[model samples]
Target: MNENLWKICFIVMFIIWVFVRKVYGTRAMKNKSKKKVRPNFEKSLVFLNFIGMVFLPLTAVFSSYLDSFNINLPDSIRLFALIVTFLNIGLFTKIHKDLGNNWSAILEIKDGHKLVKEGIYKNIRHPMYAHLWLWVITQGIILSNWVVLIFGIVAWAILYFIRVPKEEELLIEEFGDEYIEYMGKTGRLFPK
Candidate 1:
């Protein structure tokens, strides 16, 4: 297939993934009673996520105006990117399944949110973030534009570094020693 076709396929798959996540996430939230949401922007990382995951990529993918920025990656590289993107999507689905009703778009503890320690969460405290990092890397490989590629890494890196500690703190506050123990047992984004 031609490069444009490849790019279109990638973009379409991503859009479908995003649409599914949004629909299901909205349904999940609606099924639950509202919890006292812990504020997130105090440490401020969601903006970076928005820029990286939403704005930059969508702009690059949808705009032929940025076609000048396209890089000529080898077919091998493009195939590799496709594989990683699928894997990232799979992991994203798994993470959401594992979180169930406990998942929130922002940093917030839901009412009756149990500390999930099974499935993918068993070894990684933040598997969704890890999946997101994979998505960022996949974007760099698949999207030829330098701005589109770099913005994902930059924004996700900022979000990961700044938000993780605060997320952990919120968990620690809510779960106390239980969370501390979970922290000891699990790596931040990998197997401990």
Candidate 2:
């Protein structure tokens, strides 16, 4: 087996593990009975996440390997990719820790939940999304392939263009004034 093939397989397996954890590990805090009820777009988001994490990395690895294992591309690009990926991973770890049992991959709001406004949340209401953006950008860098890079970017755009508005509507419906205030204070992707 080629080194690239091995890497692609590893990435695919890792994505599967992530999906399994997300589906099985996530518990509804408020409406367990409403399990079957969810927006169709949310399901689409999950599907997109799967593709981004699994196929995007696989494509990158394949491209990198095909170029004669020459990750010897632009030094700056490689460094940029590594930095973004690592930083995003760190932010995600913080989000996971802060969320604890509240950690969920979807938009389901927990029962009796208070809006989190500390740590990373203090800076951005959507640290998770921001971290996600970083993840895609960094993966593009690591893969050093245009298709992988564009795929990641397009994935992020999908989340931003479609998912964010729907999520905000849910948040506003749930949190009302508080969520509005948070929105006023925080940029969707960057901290003010």
Candidate 3:
């Protein structure tokens, strides 16, 4: 594909992804009022995630106008990145549907939350995090800017390391032995 065509495709996919997230976020907010949120660095991590996932990528896309540094990736690599981004989007949609009303923007146990162990959740305790990993990788590969790539990696690494453990802890606290058994049978972000 031509360079401009690829850029436009990327922009369109990203816009759709953002729109879907906004819709789901609005729905999640309505269901979150009754949840008991676990105390953690969720706000800070969200800020970092926004910087990495949104701001850095946007800066990279408009870097030419901003007179900022950028790198040149081959068309093949960019195409591959685009494919991965699409896969990430598909996975995210599936995971979101699987989560249903259990989904929340933050780490919280809803009033009637049940331990999900169906569909993708059957083998992976956190498929949404796995989707985010794919997203970070896709953004890094597609952006071709050191600042953009590095920020995405660092931000996702911080969130993965800090949040996953706390989330599991909360699950264990809420579900007790059942969660422990599920942990033994499932991977944190992949199939066991």
Better of 1 and 2 by lDDT: 1
Model 1, 88-183: lDDT tens digits are 777888888888778775666776778888879997989988888888888867876677778778888877887788788888888899889988
- The Cα error of candidate 1 at residue 48, in Å, is 3.4
Question: Candidate 2 on 103-176: residue-level lDDT in tens?
Answer: 45567665555577776787587777777777776666566556666666887678667777877887788779
> Which segments of candidate 3 are over 4 A away from where they belong?
1-4, 34-40, 63-68
Q: What C-alpha lDDT values do all the predictions have? A: 0.77, 0.63, 0.77
Name the lDDT of candidate 3.
0.77
TM-score of 3: 0.90
Please provide TM-scores, in order, for all candidate models, with all chains considered together: 0.89, 0.74, 0.90
lDDT of 1 at 68: 76
Query: Which residue pairs clash within candidate 2?
Result: none
User: In model 1, which regions exceed 4 Å deviation?
Assistant: 31-44
